[PDB]
Design a protein around this ligand. Structure first.
Ligand SMILES: O=S(=O)(Nc1ccc(O)c(-c2c(O)ccc3ccccc23)c1)c1cccs1
Ligand SMILES: O=S(=O)(Nc1ccc(O)c(-c2c(O)ccc3ccccc23)c1)c1cccs1
Lengths: 208, 208
């Protein structure tokens, strides 16, 4: 029912560098997650151009940001193309192995963590703020799966029995106890307006 | 043998704005083309992760920049995933219609042409420098096609009889007579080092 996998070695080293490096501008995680949502949305929209039944599983293309101060989670929901099980296992549909190689080389020579997105591995910046990240996802061609990792070199995959999502991806960020400012309306808005002003999809910040 | 198509109205307006707006920093076209090559390369690499026969049509993933001062062309070749005929007709595998809408809205309120890539329509910046652009392309699932446009509201598509490319895309830029500085070794290198320093594929500048 639950499958446990080892991260590839270079992805574990990336996750460790992100968890351990002293670096204060942690707010960039949101930009990287939202830009991934936008790319997934760009994809389903492209497919729908020539096949509108691709949107049978939901016509609206949007991003939702949902803070929950009780659970201490920040959730980013998009109704993009989503991921098959095979995508999730392969580093969440990314060429992460070679993206890590380039990113760690760039660091050694000048670069800082904020440039992570340029190497195609922005997702792992969630670990600047989250002790555990849970990706729920549903692709037209597959069933609904949950991926999960508290880092430490392994991640799990299970078919998800939670709330059906139609199509898309939900990234649930279980936040480190000192990172709860990202659950504050004030701070989220500041970040989105600063870093995501030219995303082509409505972004709705849920209030509690 | 030759099919002629009308640009969608908003793509023609984008092309016209790019051709007519007074704007001096035209050098950005190269960054936008090379970043498209990188994305096509990211794609074939991803597919190959789980199916290595995807690289039967060529194992090397690279970008070539080829100036020809005689023909007055600058060519950008990549061995990325390439495009099917259907992709080429649909605005070269992009959601160009809605990307134009966002880009022209951003312009009206602050933005400048250099941000074109953020709206997913970087390709059309080739018209800052080229009087005519010819895209040759080959995708594993289709035959080799050539797309062509001197703007003016129409583009053509034909199956290509030129030199077989295996897999990838060649963008041939027939340069405006006052834009020949982009055929100079000096200037190309300046531009690549400035704007494309973190592309994850070798870029080889051909000498004449
Ligand atoms: O080209 S993509 O595979 N687009 C894509 C497709 C489906 C998806 O569910 C996502 C996606 C999201 O929509 C949301 C979060 C993601 C986190 C890691 C990887 C992909 C995420 C992204 C991509 C992956 C990583 C950055 S862009
Ligand atoms: O997601 S993509 O469809 N990637 C992709 C796939 C195959 C390709 O041949 C290209 C591509 C190139 O490799 C080179 C030039 C292009 C110009 C316009 C559109 C796509 C170009 C780009 C994309 C299209 C436009 C910007 S990124």
């Amino acid at each position: 029912e639950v499958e446990t996998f080892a991260f590839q070695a270079e992805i574990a080293q990336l996750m460790s560098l992100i968890i351990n490096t002293f670096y204060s501008n942690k707010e960039i995680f949101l930009r990287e997650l939202i830009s991934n949502s936008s790319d997934a949305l760009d994809k389903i929209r492209y497919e729908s151009l020539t096949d509108p039944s691709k949107l049978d599983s939901g016509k609206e293309l949007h991003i939702n940001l949902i803070p929950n101060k009780q659970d201490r989670t920040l959730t980013i929901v998009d109704t993009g193309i989503g991921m098959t099980k095979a995508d999730l296992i392969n580093n969440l549909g990314t060429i992460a192995k070679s993206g890590t190689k380039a990113f760690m080389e760039a660091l050694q020579a000048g670069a800082d963590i904020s440039m992570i997105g340029q190497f195609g591995v922005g997702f792992y910046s969630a670990y600047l703020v989250a002790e555990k990240v849970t990706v729920i996802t549903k692709h037209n061609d597959d069933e609904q799966y949950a991926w999960e990792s508290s880092a430490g070199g392994s991640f799990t995959v299970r078919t998800d029995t939670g709330e059906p999502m139609g199509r898309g991806t939900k990234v649930i960020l279980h936040l480190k106890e000192d990172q709860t400012e990202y659950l504050e309306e004030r701070r989220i808005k500041e970040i989105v307006k600063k870093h995501s002003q030219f995303i082509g999809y409505p972004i709705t910040l849920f209030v509690e």
